[PDB]
Structure formats: C-alpha cells, structure tokens
Amino acid sequence: DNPNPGPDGEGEVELEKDSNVVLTTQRDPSTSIPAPVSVKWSRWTSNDVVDDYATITSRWYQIAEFVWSKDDPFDKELARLILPRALLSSIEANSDAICDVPNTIPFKVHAYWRGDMEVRVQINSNKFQVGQLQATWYYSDHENLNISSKRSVYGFSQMDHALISASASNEAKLVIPFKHVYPFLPTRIVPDWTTGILDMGALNIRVIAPLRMSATGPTTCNVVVFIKLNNSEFTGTSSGKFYASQIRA
Amino acid sequence: EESRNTTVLDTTTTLQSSGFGRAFFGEAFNDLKTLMRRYQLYGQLLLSVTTDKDIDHCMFTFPCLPQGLALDIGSAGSPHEIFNRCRDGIIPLIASGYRFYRGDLRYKIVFPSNVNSNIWVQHRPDRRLEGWSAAKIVNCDAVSTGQGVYNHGYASHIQITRVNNVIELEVPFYNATCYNYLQAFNASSAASSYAVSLGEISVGFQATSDDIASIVNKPVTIYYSIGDGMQFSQWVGYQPMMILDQLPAPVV
Amino acid sequence: EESRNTTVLDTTTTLQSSGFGRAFFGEAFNDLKTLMRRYQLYGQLLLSVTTDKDIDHCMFTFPCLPQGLALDIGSAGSPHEIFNRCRDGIIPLIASGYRFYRGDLRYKIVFPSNVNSNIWVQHRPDRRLEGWSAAKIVNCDAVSTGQGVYNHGYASHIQITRVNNVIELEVPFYNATCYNYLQAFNASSAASSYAVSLGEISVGFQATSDDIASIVNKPVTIYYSIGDGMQFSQWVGYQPMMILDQLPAPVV
Amino acid sequence: NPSYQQSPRHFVPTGMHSLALGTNLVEPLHALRLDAAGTTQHPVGCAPDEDMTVSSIASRYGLIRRVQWKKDHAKGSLLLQLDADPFVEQRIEGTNPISLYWFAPVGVVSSMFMQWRGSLEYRFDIIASQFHTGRLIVGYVPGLTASLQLQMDYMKLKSSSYVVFDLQESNSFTFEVPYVSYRPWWVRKYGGNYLPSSTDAPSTLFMYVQVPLIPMEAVSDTIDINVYVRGGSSFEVCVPVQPSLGLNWNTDFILRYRAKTGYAPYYAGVWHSFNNSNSLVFRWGSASDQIAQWPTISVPRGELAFLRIKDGKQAAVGTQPWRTMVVWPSGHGYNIGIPTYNAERARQLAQHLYGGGSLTDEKAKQLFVPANQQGPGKVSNGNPVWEVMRAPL
Amino acid sequence: NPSYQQSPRHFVPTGMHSLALGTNLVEPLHALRLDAAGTTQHPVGCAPDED
C-alpha cells in the first residue's frame, strides 16, 4: 500500500529451480489441475530396468513460441500442441536429431514412458494491452472425431482451464498428470500401434478477448511455452536405430 | 482458474435446501448413477433374413458400449421415429460430458411375441471396434469368418421364448486397460480399437428355414442401464447441443 | 357456526356401538382411505387404428387424476353401459366432497387376451391439463409433436403379454405444488393447468402393421385405487346428486 | 421321503422387473461372467476422481456470453438482457438447417430434469486494464412477461434488486441471483418436442451502464465482458424427464409414395391369388401370402394414376429393373403392386382399371409381366420413393 | 458349485392380486418412481387437516 521503487524496481521474483534451469516470474501463476496425481505403474507390466532420469528429464525446455497480434478474431486457436509429440517435434523442427537435447535422450533408447507434466505458458504483454487467452488441456484429442466442433472457448471453459490476461501479464501453470487408456505411451513404432505414437492429447491455446489497444499502441506480443517431465519412468531399453522421426504436422 | 470467485456480490438470503427433492418427493436426485441405472433404449431393429440360415448362424450383432450407438435415424422413407424425433437419451447425454469409463453394463433385450424359437446370446470381448462407422446393430447376412457362427468358449445364455421373450443380462468389463474412450470414437491405431466397447454381443435364433418366415420384419428392442461399479473419470465439457422443439413439424 | 348445538333434546338411551361393523363383521369401516384403496374402473376403450403406426407410436393416452375422467357415456348408438347405467364410482364421489389433494395413485390396466405383443407404458408428468374437455382417454391418431413417440427419459415399464396381460403400477406425486385441484377443472391460467393431474400416462404397442389387425376393436380397461400417503385437505360440501333407480328403463 | 401335503403359494406373474427404479433394490440378472460373487474393481491408480453428481456438474462455470462495452455507449445503454434460468443459449452461426447451441453445464444437466430451483451465479469478467474506469448495474427484476421485456431502462431496474459495480483495479465479480417465484420448483424452459409445454423464465436479469466508460488515450476504447454461468450452492433439480437437448454427433433430421411400412424390401414374384401364379406382383417374403401392401392413391373421377420409381437403381430386379407399376385392390383387403415393362404399359393398365375394368379381364392380364420374367427375384433397396404419375382419363 | 437336488415348491398361479382388499396387506407394484424406498411426503404446511 506504500510504494517505494528503487534501482531494483520494487518487485518479488518467484523462482522455479528444476535441475539447473531456473524460471522467473514477476506475477502469480494461475494454476489448473485436471486430474489428481497419478501412481507409478512399473509393478504391473514391466520387468525391465525401470528408471527415470530426473537430472535431465525434469528440466525446462521451450516447445513453442508464437506471436499473438491484434489481427486475430474472437474464437481463434493460436496453439495446438500434442505435448509428448510436440517436444520431439519442436526439437526436430529446429533441424537436428533427438540425441542433441538432454531432455529427450531416454526417448531415443527406451520404448515406453509414463510420467506427469508441468507446463508454463508465459506471455510478455504490455500493461496497456488488453486481452485474454485460454490454456485448456484435453486428454486424447485424436480419439474423438467430433472435436472439430468442440474446439472453441465456449466448450473449453466448461472443463477446467487456465486464464491468461494480457493486462496483468500473468502466467499459466498446468499440472498435467498421466491419464490415458493404456498405462504407457510407446515412444516408437511398437506392435499393433502404428499411428498416434506418444500422443496423450492437445494443449490448445485459443483467444477469448482479442488484443485491444490504442491507435499507436504496441501491436503484438509474444507467448512462450515450457514443459517439464517430473514423475517419469522409462521402460523397455531398446536400440536407438529402431526409433523413427515424428510426424511433422 | 475455472471455479474461482473474485468477488461474490450476494444480495440474497438463505434458501431452504430440499435435499434434491428428498423433502418433497421422498427421494434425492443428487447421485447421477441412480439416474443412469434407469433403463434406456440402446436400439431397435426389424429382423430380415436374406440367405438361408443354419442353426449356428447369428441373427444380428452389435458392439456393447455405454455412450450409445451411431444414432440410427433410419431410412428416408421409413425413419425410426424415436431416434428421429427425440434424438438421444439421458445416459449418452451424460456420457458425452466425460472422457473415460470403467465398469459393467446391463442389457435387457425384448424379442417379438408370436415367435417361439429358443434364442442364444453370446458376448465376445474379442471384436475390436474399427471406427465410429459400423458401430451399430449389424444384420448378419453371410457367414465367411467365425463371426456368424455360435462359438464355443464365450459367455452365452439361452432364453426360452415359450417361457419369456425377454432376456436380462450383465456385460462385464473385460478390457486389459485402465479405461476406455467415452466419445464418438476415431480409430487412429490398432490397439485403440480394443478399448472402445466392452465386447460384442451376438444374438441368434435356433430356427430352421420353415419357422424363420414368421420372424421376418418383427421388431427387436434393446435397452441398457449403466450397472454398478461404473465410474466416469475425466471431466470434459459438453459439445454443441440442439433444441428439440425447434425441430420442424411434419406439416400436411 | 356449522356443527353447533343450541339445545339437544335427547329422548333416547345409550345405543351399543358396534365399532363400524368390527363387532359383527370383524372389520371397521371408519377409515375412508381403506375404502378408497379398493380398485374402481378408471375407464374402458376399444382399440382403433386409423393410420399405419410405427413401433414408437403410442396407442392411447390419458391424464392420471384421482377425481375421475370426464364421464364417457359413449356414443348414442353404442353407449358404454357402465358409465351410462350406474353413473360414477365411489372414489370420485368421495373426491367431489373435497377441494385439494396430495399423493400417489395406483393404476391396474387390463389388456385384451388374444393379443401377444409387448406393451410399453410411460408416465409423462409434463403435460399440463387444458380444460375439463379432452380430460379423457385419447386415441393417438397421428404423430406431429413428441406426443405420439415413445420418449427416452420418462418412467416407463414394459409388460410382457405372453406372461401376463395386466400391468400394476404406481403413479407418484411429481407436481411442484402444495396441492392440486380436485373438482371438474376450469382452466383460467397456464400455471393452473400444471396442477390438475399428476401426469399423463401413454400406453403403446410394439406391434407392426400385420399384427395390429388382430388388436382392432379389442377392449382395454383401466382401474385405479387411491394409493397411500393420499390426503384430502379441504372440506367442500357435495353438489346436486342424481338418483340412479329413477333413471328410465330401456322399454321395448 | 415324507410327503409335503400343506397348501402352496398363490402368486401373480409379471414379465419384467422395474424398468425405472434404480436405487434401493437388488436387480437379478443373468450375469455373463464366470464367478457369481465377482464384481468390477478399480485398482489402484485407475480409481474414480469425479463422482457422478449433479451438484458437482452445476458448480462449474461455463462461458455463455461475450459483450462489447464501448466508449460511445451512453449512460444507461443496454448491454445484455437474459433469462434467470439455466437455459441460456449461444447460437452458432452455422449453415445447417438445424442450429446448434452452446450451453452452460448447469443448463445441460438441467435439460434432463423437469423442475429446478435455487440460486444462479453469473461471473462477470471484465477484460480491462487498471487504467479503464467504468461503472455498471447488474440488476434483477422478479417475474416479467413478454410484453414487459420491453419498457425497460436502468431506472425501473433500481426498483428491484440490483448491484452496482465499480471498475478501478479489480476486473471481475460474481452476482448471485435470487430465486423468487410463486412455486417452490420451476418447470424447465423447453419440452421434448411438445410445443404446448413451453415456459419462460421465473425472472429476468439485466445489465445496463450506470456510468459510461472513461478510457485513457493510451488504451483501447472497447472492452470485452465475459459472462459465465454455474448453478449456485442452493441450486437443485428433481424430476427426470426426457431431456430437451440432443447431441450433435448425428446432426441429421428427416422430414416426414412407397410401400406400407414393413412391406419392404420387396421383389417381383408370383402368387396363386393373382392370375393363378402366371404374372409378377410385389412380395415382401417367400412364404404364405407375404404380399407387399400399398397405400391408396387419392384419385378423383376423371383421372388415373400409376407409379414410376424415382431412382431406378433402387428398384426390384427381375429380367429388368421394375421401375413402373400399377397399384390396385387385390380382392383380399389390401392393394397390390403390379409391375409393368414400362410407363406406356403402366398407363394402359391404369386406363383399363380406372376406366372400369378388372384384374381378371383379358385386357388387363395381357398388360401384366409374365412369371417367366421373375429372373433372380432381387429385392428393392429398402422402401424407395415412387413418383405418382397422374393423367386425365 | 454344488448341485441342489432337493424337491422344489408346488404352487397355484393366479393373474391378479386382491382387487377388493385394501387394509392389512402389502400390495406389490411396479412403482414408476426412481427410489424403491421413496414415498410421498407432506412438509410441512401442506399437511392434512381433515382425515
């Protein structure tokens, strides 16, 4: 209630320090948790050496950056990421192999995976900009054919979601646990599973309030998405030459 | 950030809670599983016999899934007036607002009256469901594979039509999964096809060629409840609905 | 100032109380609810099929109300001899001497014998009752709205005619009111139409066009008791009665 | 082995259990399992998290409205008026002949039930900076008819219950709606396609502009307002009926000449009661008197009629597709369908019969198709539509 | 799974219950309600005054 800015700026930085990667937020995160915390399931269907690599897999790594402008209508999708595929496809979109990033080197060598997720969607918007976005997670997007009529902010507001206001420039934390029909997702081509490899559903960022401003205001803003794999477990140690690149999309 | 409340501007007072009708009607309508255990029409069909059938041939087949079949409006000449007029029931309307399920189902099949023949019903939990197309009641017209034939090892039951022409059965959960999908299924892989329906129910008659002539164009209706131990485990919002009394009237 | 007594000029002695026949007949006829739980004819009709019906079409419809229907004397050529000769039963004669009711009803519907077809019965507590006209058994002759069609979410039951051609059901109290009117209803508003009958019972056959020919001109009778938890809550005196053995005889 | 000589029981039989009851009974079944004591399980991570509960569904906010509130909106301009019910609609601007709608989850879960009561909660999220300044009323008028939906301003609103909200630094609030009626519950807005069951709201919600918007010259002049609906802590529904809403999975509706229902598919075969089995007539089966039956065409004196199938690919097939026919009484209490080689023959047969002739006349018999043209006796594709061909006679 | 080999019951069937009796029996029905233990209520001002 009594402001006194100095050379530092009178703020309070919140830190997310996860395995030598530190994320900083000026604002408070707007969290939303779709499902409760999952259990480890190496008991029921694995006899191979099952081990996470928490020093290299529970790190933060950007998977998407995009430009939200004022030339977007009311109900318009900005991002639609199939996150376990989107990590590998964001690496392959930077034109290299998957063995050059320490986050994804167990995906090259193992066969199956189960772990929870942490998604940070950070906007960099001016204080005078006005707008609002959704951060809605949907489990198993491709297994529903009527999802093309579902992708709208009217339907995504009904399930739980994270709101991002362009004025406050706040942040969206997304605790995504593993919830799938099968208790493991294969990383490569595996028997009677040829398509939809390592797909758990779509994080899709759409617009509620389009970006509004004055006549000479800053036209665009930037949105960056980071991901974390914290409660992982990798089973089925295999050859890396069996692995193939992801579908481009 | 969905059910939050920044500032609740209550201008009201305390309203007397009836306990979801338990005060007035002696029953609480809060548990939605109590609503879903009321039976609702899974489907109806008219029996049609094209080729000469043996005793082993199944009369019709259908996958058993809780979110309701592909909505059979019928032919343009003769539409099924239940699914055309009042589009869909309560149970799939609830199941549209979820993603995953796990549990049993309850099927009550009502056969025609003037037939007398002894009826067998098998449940095969082997048939994977390939796409939302052909997720419907299928009239078995020919026998090429082991689909048309009454097989040995499945869970079967025979209803005596002379005693009673209705069968009441419970389909168990036999998939090797954590859940199954509870939407209009889109087939991506082969393993995802194993995890749509519980199984595949085949109903067949033991009639010969002479007694099957009295069975043609007779109606068979199938009803289903939700069973118990039946859990929906992921909240998904509802799709665009359609208002029923906005549908056009058959003007003359 | 109704049950007062200024001066009682008793010239009598003490008369031995029998306890309303409990001394002589082993039963006390004091509780009038015991009398009203005896079944009494709600109505009767001959089934008539004008247009071609589907499986979903309802055969006939009637509102369910305790004070008895509009008294169907029948046609001038062929009158219904029960309602013509001995005009009305016990239960509506009691219900004429009250104003309000609250509670359930019990309906026992007796179907014809030589029919075999499986019969569905739905209770729709949605149909408001518009005037004392068309408060009667209505033969569904065409399907324009969702009235003729077997709907999904209502309380339904299917009777197997091959086992037994009589259904015994209990209609619950589902109005959102304190009471309902218990006279010959005159429709003033739209909200008052929601509070006459409990609901609206529709009975339909699952027969096709070939088996429905044996059902034409067959009688269906409907009986009703008063149920329990059934309370009449305002004393109104009786209307002008009519003496039954003063009615003329069919002279030849 | 003693003999049991006492009197036995004396029941009533019924053919089916409770088709509607579902809570406090034990329904016996033929379970298609192997163990009679076996049920389904949930071990241990595939456990239920969301209970199927109407108070848990209706407690979830659904976005129903967006409202543009501009700088040039005058003092007292209407932003929204809507109905104080869970049945609030958002129409999709699609090209289908039947329009789809967005609903709140409270409205979807209240469509299945006949009667509702309780408080509603409207969350207003006003997307603005901390440099926009405005003030608006979210008011609430008890029961209004359709003719009182107009004659409404911000001044008649302040006679009833209302809430004035200031917008300086907090850009969101929640208005809890009172439940004022003459009736403890309230019958829902739409029926199961029974148009004489329509009922409007118990009451009406408004949102006017008490103080107009003053934006600074560095920010925008328009502000979005989101309106979210969920049923409040006192909301409840009771009586289950047919739900007034349908899915959009199969968005296909069928508006109401062909064979009477059930008498199709049919093929052209023979019958001992039609020219002593010598000529083709449509049959719906191979057994005793399984003859297809056909509606009576309304034909005035001075005209004839015959039939020509609209799509020949759907016709029954013998030595040719049977695309033309005449319908006439069989003498056995229904009309039969008599195929002809072509339209010319059909017109000549109709001329003969509507002209006063009989099916047993030699002139008629010579216009039938002979039995040796039955060929494979293929059935029609379902029950296809025929055009009624009319001519003066 | 043992086999029950004793002698079974030996009834008489009738098609309808007591159409006239109404006091001291429990008449079974197909109640068109949702709860099997549910009855009708009178809370609390819509109570019966005239028996």
PDB file of N, CA and C in Angstrom, chain D residues 226-283:
ATOM      1  N   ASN D 226     -16.930 -11.072 -20.318  1.00  0.00           N
ATOM      2  CA  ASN D 226     -17.367 -12.459 -20.335  1.00  0.00           C
ATOM      3  C   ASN D 226     -18.392 -12.710 -19.245  1.00  0.00           C
ATOM      4  N   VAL D 227     -19.409 -13.492 -19.588  1.00  0.00           N
ATOM      5  CA  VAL D 227     -20.472 -13.880 -18.674  1.00  0.00           C
ATOM      6  C   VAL D 227     -20.469 -15.397 -18.585  1.00  0.00           C
ATOM      7  N   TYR D 228     -20.141 -15.901 -17.391  1.00  0.00           N
ATOM      8  CA  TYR D 228     -20.068 -17.314 -17.047  1.00  0.00           C
ATOM      9  C   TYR D 228     -21.249 -17.681 -16.158  1.00  0.00           C
ATOM     10  N   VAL D 229     -21.779 -18.889 -16.338  1.00  0.00           N
ATOM     11  CA  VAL D 229     -22.924 -19.364 -15.572  1.00  0.00           C
ATOM     12  C   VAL D 229     -22.558 -20.666 -14.871  1.00  0.00           C
ATOM     13  N   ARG D 230     -22.871 -20.733 -13.578  1.00  0.00           N
ATOM     14  CA  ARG D 230     -22.957 -22.015 -12.895  1.00  0.00           C
ATOM     15  C   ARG D 230     -24.070 -21.923 -11.864  1.00  0.00           C
ATOM     16  N   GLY D 231     -24.695 -23.066 -11.595  1.00  0.00           N
ATOM     17  CA  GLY D 231     -25.713 -23.166 -10.576  1.00  0.00           C
ATOM     18  C   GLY D 231     -25.080 -23.064  -9.206  1.00  0.00           C
ATOM     19  N   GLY D 232     -25.623 -22.175  -8.378  1.00  0.00           N
ATOM     20  CA  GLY D 232     -25.029 -21.862  -7.091  1.00  0.00           C
ATOM     21  C   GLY D 232     -25.122 -22.950  -6.041  1.00  0.00           C
ATOM     22  N   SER D 233     -24.815 -22.590  -4.795  1.00  0.00           N
ATOM     23  CA  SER D 233     -24.792 -23.551  -3.701  1.00  0.00           C
ATOM     24  C   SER D 233     -26.175 -24.043  -3.303  1.00  0.00           C
ATOM     25  N   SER D 234     -27.229 -23.323  -3.675  1.00  0.00           N
ATOM     26  CA  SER D 234     -28.594 -23.728  -3.384  1.00  0.00           C
ATOM     27  C   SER D 234     -29.323 -24.275  -4.603  1.00  0.00           C
ATOM     28  N   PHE D 235     -28.639 -24.430  -5.734  1.00  0.00           N
ATOM     29  CA  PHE D 235     -29.288 -24.936  -6.936  1.00  0.00           C
ATOM     30  C   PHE D 235     -29.519 -26.437  -6.828  1.00  0.00           C
ATOM     31  N   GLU D 236     -30.682 -26.886  -7.301  1.00  0.00           N
ATOM     32  CA  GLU D 236     -31.035 -28.298  -7.283  1.00  0.00           C
ATOM     33  C   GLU D 236     -32.138 -28.569  -8.300  1.00  0.00           C
ATOM     34  N   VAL D 237     -32.152 -29.802  -8.815  1.00  0.00           N
ATOM     35  CA  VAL D 237     -33.128 -30.271  -9.793  1.00  0.00           C
ATOM     36  C   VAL D 237     -33.713 -31.586  -9.287  1.00  0.00           C
ATOM     37  N   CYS D 238     -34.977 -31.849  -9.635  1.00  0.00           N
ATOM     38  CA  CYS D 238     -35.553 -33.085  -9.114  1.00  0.00           C
ATOM     39  C   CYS D 238     -36.011 -34.129 -10.134  1.00  0.00           C
ATOM     40  N   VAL D 239     -37.046 -33.866 -10.921  1.00  0.00           N
ATOM     41  CA  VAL D 239     -37.803 -34.935 -11.572  1.00  0.00           C
ATOM     42  C   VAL D 239     -37.185 -35.227 -12.935  1.00  0.00           C
ATOM     43  N   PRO D 240     -36.742 -36.455 -13.199  1.00  0.00           N
ATOM     44  CA  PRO D 240     -36.156 -36.776 -14.506  1.00  0.00           C
ATOM     45  C   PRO D 240     -37.235 -36.972 -15.558  1.00  0.00           C
ATOM     46  N   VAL D 241     -37.056 -36.306 -16.694  1.00  0.00           N
ATOM     47  CA  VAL D 241     -37.940 -36.433 -17.848  1.00  0.00           C
ATOM     48  C   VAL D 241     -37.083 -36.656 -19.084  1.00  0.00           C
ATOM     49  N   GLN D 242     -37.711 -36.656 -20.254  1.00  0.00           N
ATOM     50  CA  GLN D 242     -36.956 -36.719 -21.497  1.00  0.00           C
ATOM     51  C   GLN D 242     -36.185 -35.415 -21.667  1.00  0.00           C
ATOM     52  N   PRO D 243     -34.879 -35.474 -21.921  1.00  0.00           N
ATOM     53  CA  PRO D 243     -34.088 -34.241 -21.992  1.00  0.00           C
ATOM     54  C   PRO D 243     -34.407 -33.451 -23.246  1.00  0.00           C
ATOM     55  N   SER D 244     -34.483 -32.136 -23.095  1.00  0.00           N
ATOM     56  CA  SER D 244     -34.862 -31.252 -24.186  1.00  0.00           C
ATOM     57  C   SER D 244     -33.699 -30.908 -25.106  1.00  0.00           C
ATOM     58  N   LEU D 245     -32.545 -31.551 -24.938  1.00  0.00           N
ATOM     59  CA  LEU D 245     -31.377 -31.295 -25.764  1.00  0.00           C
ATOM     60  C   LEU D 245     -30.874 -32.597 -26.367  1.00  0.00           C
ATOM     61  N   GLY D 246     -30.238 -32.491 -27.530  1.00  0.00           N
ATOM     62  CA  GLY D 246     -29.684 -33.636 -28.227  1.00  0.00           C
ATOM     63  C   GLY D 246     -28.234 -33.397 -28.603  1.00  0.00           C
ATOM     64  N   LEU D 247     -27.519 -34.485 -28.875  1.00  0.00           N
ATOM     65  CA  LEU D 247     -26.124 -34.384 -29.265  1.00  0.00           C
ATOM     66  C   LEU D 247     -26.007 -33.924 -30.715  1.00  0.00           C
ATOM     67  N   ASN D 248     -24.806 -33.475 -31.082  1.00  0.00           N
ATOM     68  CA  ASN D 248     -24.503 -33.111 -32.459  1.00  0.00           C
ATOM     69  C   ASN D 248     -23.673 -34.168 -33.178  1.00  0.00           C
ATOM     70  N   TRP D 249     -23.685 -35.408 -32.686  1.00  0.00           N
ATOM     71  CA  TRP D 249     -22.893 -36.464 -33.307  1.00  0.00           C
ATOM     72  C   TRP D 249     -23.493 -36.869 -34.647  1.00  0.00           C
ATOM     73  N   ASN D 250     -24.805 -37.053 -34.682  1.00  0.00           N
ATOM     74  CA  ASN D 250     -25.549 -37.285 -35.915  1.00  0.00           C
ATOM     75  C   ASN D 250     -26.539 -36.130 -36.040  1.00  0.00           C
ATOM     76  N   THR D 251     -26.120 -35.073 -36.731  1.00  0.00           N
ATOM     77  CA  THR D 251     -26.942 -33.874 -36.890  1.00  0.00           C
ATOM     78  C   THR D 251     -27.709 -34.037 -38.198  1.00  0.00           C
ATOM     79  N   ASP D 252     -28.654 -34.977 -38.199  1.00  0.00           N
ATOM     80  CA  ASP D 252     -29.426 -35.310 -39.395  1.00  0.00           C
ATOM     81  C   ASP D 252     -30.875 -35.520 -38.984  1.00  0.00           C
ATOM     82  N   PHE D 253     -31.778 -34.745 -39.575  1.00  0.00           N
ATOM     83  CA  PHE D 253     -33.205 -34.835 -39.300  1.00  0.00           C
ATOM     84  C   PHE D 253     -33.929 -35.225 -40.581  1.00  0.00           C
ATOM     85  N   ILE D 254     -35.004 -35.995 -40.443  1.00  0.00           N
ATOM     86  CA  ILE D 254     -35.772 -36.487 -41.581  1.00  0.00           C
ATOM     87  C   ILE D 254     -37.180 -35.917 -41.473  1.00  0.00           C
ATOM     88  N   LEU D 255     -37.555 -35.086 -42.440  1.00  0.00           N
ATOM     89  CA  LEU D 255     -38.941 -34.662 -42.578  1.00  0.00           C
ATOM     90  C   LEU D 255     -39.747 -35.771 -43.241  1.00  0.00           C
ATOM     91  N   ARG D 256     -40.852 -35.945 -42.593  1.00  0.00           N
ATOM     92  CA  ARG D 256     -41.809 -36.893 -42.886  1.00  0.00           C
ATOM     93  C   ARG D 256     -42.149 -36.613 -44.292  1.00  0.00           C
ATOM     94  N   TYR D 257     -44.606 -41.498 -52.099  1.00  0.00           N
ATOM     95  CA  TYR D 257     -45.287 -42.775 -52.296  1.00  0.00           C
ATOM     96  C   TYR D 257     -44.324 -43.959 -52.169  1.00  0.00           C
ATOM     97  N   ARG D 258     -44.653 -44.881 -51.273  1.00  0.00           N
ATOM     98  CA  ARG D 258     -43.894 -46.116 -51.155  1.00  0.00           C
ATOM     99  C   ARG D 258     -44.769 -47.183 -50.514  1.00  0.00           C
ATOM    100  N   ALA D 259     -44.203 -48.362 -50.292  1.00  0.00           N
ATOM    101  CA  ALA D 259     -44.976 -49.458 -49.715  1.00  0.00           C
ATOM    102  C   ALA D 259     -45.349 -49.134 -48.277  1.00  0.00           C
ATOM    103  N   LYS D 260     -46.451 -49.692 -47.787  1.00  0.00           N
ATOM    104  CA  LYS D 260     -46.784 -49.522 -46.379  1.00  0.00           C
ATOM    105  C   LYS D 260     -45.617 -50.036 -45.536  1.00  0.00           C
ATOM    106  N   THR D 261     -45.421 -49.432 -44.368  1.00  0.00           N
ATOM    107  CA  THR D 261     -44.247 -49.722 -43.567  1.00  0.00           C
ATOM    108  C   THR D 261     -44.140 -51.197 -43.210  1.00  0.00           C
ATOM    109  N   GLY D 262     -42.957 -51.767 -43.400  1.00  0.00           N
ATOM    110  CA  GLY D 262     -42.725 -53.166 -43.120  1.00  0.00           C
ATOM    111  C   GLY D 262     -42.811 -54.060 -44.349  1.00  0.00           C
ATOM    112  N   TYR D 263     -43.508 -53.594 -45.390  1.00  0.00           N
ATOM    113  CA  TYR D 263     -43.744 -54.427 -46.576  1.00  0.00           C
ATOM    114  C   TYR D 263     -42.653 -54.229 -47.636  1.00  0.00           C
ATOM    115  N   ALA D 264     -41.467 -53.861 -47.163  1.00  0.00           N
ATOM    116  CA  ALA D 264     -40.280 -53.670 -47.988  1.00  0.00           C
ATOM    117  C   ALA D 264     -39.063 -54.117 -47.178  1.00  0.00           C
ATOM    118  N   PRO D 265     -37.968 -54.513 -47.845  1.00  0.00           N
ATOM    119  CA  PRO D 265     -37.793 -54.684 -49.290  1.00  0.00           C
ATOM    120  C   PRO D 265     -38.753 -55.721 -49.888  1.00  0.00           C
ATOM    121  N   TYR D 266     -39.004 -55.580 -51.179  1.00  0.00           N
ATOM    122  CA  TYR D 266     -39.918 -56.475 -51.876  1.00  0.00           C
ATOM    123  C   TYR D 266     -39.256 -56.883 -53.183  1.00  0.00           C
ATOM    124  N   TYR D 267     -39.713 -58.000 -53.735  1.00  0.00           N
ATOM    125  CA  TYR D 267     -39.280 -58.444 -55.050  1.00  0.00           C
ATOM    126  C   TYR D 267     -40.517 -58.793 -55.867  1.00  0.00           C
ATOM    127  N   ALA D 268     -40.368 -58.817 -57.185  1.00  0.00           N
ATOM    128  CA  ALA D 268     -41.468 -59.233 -58.044  1.00  0.00           C
ATOM    129  C   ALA D 268     -41.463 -60.746 -58.200  1.00  0.00           C
ATOM    130  N   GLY D 269     -42.487 -61.390 -57.656  1.00  0.00           N
ATOM    131  CA  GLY D 269     -42.647 -62.831 -57.747  1.00  0.00           C
ATOM    132  C   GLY D 269     -44.064 -63.189 -58.145  1.00  0.00           C
ATOM    133  N   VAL D 270     -44.517 -64.386 -57.780  1.00  0.00           N
ATOM    134  CA  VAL D 270     -45.853 -64.847 -58.178  1.00  0.00           C
ATOM    135  C   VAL D 270     -46.717 -65.230 -56.983  1.00  0.00           C
ATOM    136  N   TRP D 271     -48.021 -65.322 -57.219  1.00  0.00           N
ATOM    137  CA  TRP D 271     -48.988 -65.560 -56.156  1.00  0.00           C
ATOM    138  C   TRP D 271     -50.181 -66.290 -56.724  1.00  0.00           C
ATOM    139  N   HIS D 272     -50.634 -67.345 -56.058  1.00  0.00           N
ATOM    140  CA  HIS D 272     -51.749 -68.119 -56.589  1.00  0.00           C
ATOM    141  C   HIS D 272     -53.044 -67.307 -56.649  1.00  0.00           C
ATOM    142  N   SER D 273     -53.094 -66.199 -55.908  1.00  0.00           N
ATOM    143  CA  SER D 273     -54.294 -65.370 -55.859  1.00  0.00           C
ATOM    144  C   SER D 273     -54.214 -64.159 -56.780  1.00  0.00           C
ATOM    145  N   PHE D 274     -53.155 -64.088 -57.584  1.00  0.00           N
ATOM    146  CA  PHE D 274     -53.043 -63.072 -58.628  1.00  0.00           C
ATOM    147  C   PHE D 274     -52.786 -63.763 -59.965  1.00  0.00           C
ATOM    148  N   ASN D 275     -53.840 -63.863 -60.767  1.00  0.00           N
ATOM    149  CA  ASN D 275     -53.784 -64.533 -62.071  1.00  0.00           C
ATOM    150  C   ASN D 275     -53.152 -65.921 -62.001  1.00  0.00           C
ATOM    151  N   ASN D 276     -53.526 -66.679 -60.974  1.00  0.00           N
ATOM    152  CA  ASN D 276     -53.108 -68.078 -60.820  1.00  0.00           C
ATOM    153  C   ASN D 276     -51.606 -68.308 -61.007  1.00  0.00           C
ATOM    154  N   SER D 277     -50.806 -67.466 -60.352  1.00  0.00           N
ATOM    155  CA  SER D 277     -49.338 -67.529 -60.350  1.00  0.00           C
ATOM    156  C   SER D 277     -48.676 -67.259 -61.704  1.00  0.00           C
ATOM    157  N   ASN D 278     -49.416 -66.714 -62.665  1.00  0.00           N
ATOM    158  CA  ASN D 278     -48.874 -66.528 -64.011  1.00  0.00           C
ATOM    159  C   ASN D 278     -48.228 -65.169 -64.272  1.00  0.00           C
ATOM    160  N   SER D 279     -48.356 -64.247 -63.318  1.00  0.00           N
ATOM    161  CA  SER D 279     -47.891 -62.870 -63.511  1.00  0.00           C
ATOM    162  C   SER D 279     -47.198 -62.306 -62.283  1.00  0.00           C
ATOM    163  N   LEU D 280     -46.311 -61.332 -62.482  1.00  0.00           N
ATOM    164  CA  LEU D 280     -45.499 -60.783 -61.380  1.00  0.00           C
ATOM    165  C   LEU D 280     -46.277 -59.786 -60.514  1.00  0.00           C
ATOM    166  N   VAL D 281     -46.047 -59.884 -59.205  1.00  0.00           N
ATOM    167  CA  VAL D 281     -46.637 -58.991 -58.205  1.00  0.00           C
ATOM    168  C   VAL D 281     -45.595 -58.829 -57.104  1.00  0.00           C
ATOM    169  N   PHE D 282     -45.528 -57.659 -56.477  1.00  0.00           N
ATOM    170  CA  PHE D 282     -44.507 -57.444 -55.453  1.00  0.00           C
ATOM    171  C   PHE D 282     -44.833 -58.201 -54.152  1.00  0.00           C
ATOM    172  N   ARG D 283     -43.825 -58.918 -53.658  1.00  0.00           N
ATOM    173  CA  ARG D 283     -43.897 -59.747 -52.456  1.00  0.00           C
ATOM    174  C   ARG D 283     -42.851 -59.278 -51.454  1.00  0.00           C
TER     175      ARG D 283
END
